[PDB]
Ligand binder design. Structure first.
Ligand SMILES: O=[N+]([O-])c1ccc(O[C@H]2O[C@H](CO)[C@H](O)[C@H](O)[C@H]2O)cc1
Length: 453
């Protein structure tokens, strides 16, 4: 039994954790372009460089978390530090409207990077608590839905309430409203950190005496344990492919809603229905993973978005008008993404257990470093592939193109995510082994091996 209290406290921790970044991810473009007034090229270059640099930084944070011998634990201290420092840096991030000229181009450039690193400090260790809470298949299956559901809910309520709050509190001074809302986020986020730190207790931590973890390891060694843990490498590839495809699809949606108005008030309906789908499929995930195989659910996680892509491909070939097609594609995609995230967290935990099984080392921090690194690098790589595709199609001037050229660009933008999803499902079914009796073997081997000295 995982104490219902620990489940709920981890859920609220995840809520506060993703409620502090959803605003950034979603409206930092709007803030920096519509409020601060910075060139879109500057913002894009900064975002891409920062994602690459944060992805490079992630394994560094994993090494840091692994080598930290502390009282609270090897995770909670960095969780607290990252939470507080990232709260401060988020407030500073959205306080950019105050400065002007180079002074703010530096400010914006200095805060943003600091916002990305700081979050890493708390992001890697937080999820590293999943493997230490339990080692059982079904207990993980019923543990992770709580945090994933709460994170998704944070994202959607952010989308719903952030603009109303800014308009009501600040009005003309939209930047003041943004930073006041940041304060709301900080309150929820710090309270969530306190809750998770107090009520979540580590059982199978690498800082316990019976575990096989070695604190005094090098950065070369740790990053090599990604390659040695073939299952973690397979997870890296799969998650990178899934993230690249999901980022391409989300960019398509951003263009087809922001630039192409489509129909008025289609985006609110789409967002509401898609959030319902996401949160519901997260709520029923234990029942589904009992009824259907975990493998079936991963296959579905990749396939359902592919069905969305195919449907809206058909819409591209025909008239791009059906709102039902759009909202149904969103529903399918959100079901898939929820399944993916739940299964991915469980799979990172399974990979740390398999690392102890094979290499005789327990490193949670590195597996979740791979998770976050892949989140950043998927966006970066999706940008790279999109730029390659657009340059190949002849959009590299970005001045004016044939309508047929634009439609073919849409077609390719649709097919590419499908290729990446096929990559992830193919790689999962060809190389991944931690799903069945192997999971039980690793669990029993670890429990039996957990005998002092
Ligand atoms: O498609 N998006 O815009 C998008 C949504 C959520 C997100 O956050 C996830 O990746 C983070 C990595 O820093 C944290 O692991 C966090 O816990 C995850 O929920 C990242 C991007």
């Amino acid at each position: 039994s995982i104490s219902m209290t620990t489940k709920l406290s981890y859920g609220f921790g995840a809520f506060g954790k993703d409620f502090a970044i959803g605003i950034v991810y979603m409206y930092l473009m709007y803030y920096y372009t519509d409020v601060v007034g910075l060139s879109v090229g500057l913002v894009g270059t900064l975002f891409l460089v920062a994602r690459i640099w944060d992805a490079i930084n992630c394994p560094i944070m994993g090494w840091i978390v692994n080598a930290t011998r502390s009282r609270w634990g090897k995770f909670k201290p960095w969780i607290l530090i990252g939470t507080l420092t990232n709260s401060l840096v988020l407030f500073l991030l959205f306080s950019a409207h105050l400065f002007e000229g180079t002074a703010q181009v530096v400010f914006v450039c200095v805060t943003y990077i600091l916002w990305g690193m700081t979050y890493t400090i708390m992001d890697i260790p937080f999820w590293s608590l999943v493997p230490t809470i339990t080692l059982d298949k079904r207990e993980r299956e019923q543990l992770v839905p709580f945090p994933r559901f709460f994170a998704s809910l944070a994202g959607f309520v952010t989308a719903g309430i952030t603009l109303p709050f800014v308009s009501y509190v600040g009005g003309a001074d939209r930047g003041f409203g943004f930073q006041m809302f940041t304060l709301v986020l900080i309150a929820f986020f710090i309270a969530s950190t306190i809750v998770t730190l107090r009520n979540v207790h580590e059982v199978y931590s690498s800082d316990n005496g019976v575990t096989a973890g070695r604190p005094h390891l090098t950065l070369k060694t740790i990053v090599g344990l990604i390659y040695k843990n073939d299952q973690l490498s397979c997870l890296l590839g799969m998650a990178l492919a899934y993230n690249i495809a999901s980022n391409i699809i989300n960019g398509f949606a951003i263009y087809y809603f922001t630039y192409v108005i489509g129909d008025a008030d289609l985006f609110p309906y789409y967002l509401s229905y898609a959030g319902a789908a996401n949160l519901l499929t997260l709520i029923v995930f234990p029942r589904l993973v009992k009824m259907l195989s975990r493998r079936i659910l991963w296959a579905g996680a990749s396939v359902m978005p592919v069905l969305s892509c195919a449907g809206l491909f058909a819409m591209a070939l025909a008239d791009i008008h059906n709102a039902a097609l759009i909202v149904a594609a969103g529903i399918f995609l959100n079901i898939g993404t929820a399944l993916f995230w739940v299964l991915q967290v469980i799979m990172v935990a399974d990979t740390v257990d398999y690392g102890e099984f094979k290499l005789n080392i327990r490193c949670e921090s590195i597996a979740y470093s791979v998770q976050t690194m892949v989140v950043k690098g998927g966006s970066a790589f999706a940008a790279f592939f999109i730029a390659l595709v657009l340059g190949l199609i002849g959009y590299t001037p970005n001045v004016a193109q044939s309508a047929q050229t634009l439609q073919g660009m849409q077609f390719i933008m649709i097919v590419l995510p499908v290729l990446f999803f096929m990559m992830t499902l193919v790689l999962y079914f060809r190389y991944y082994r931690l799903n069945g009796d192997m999971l039980r073997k690793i669990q029993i081997h670890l429990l039996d091996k957990y005998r002092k000295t």
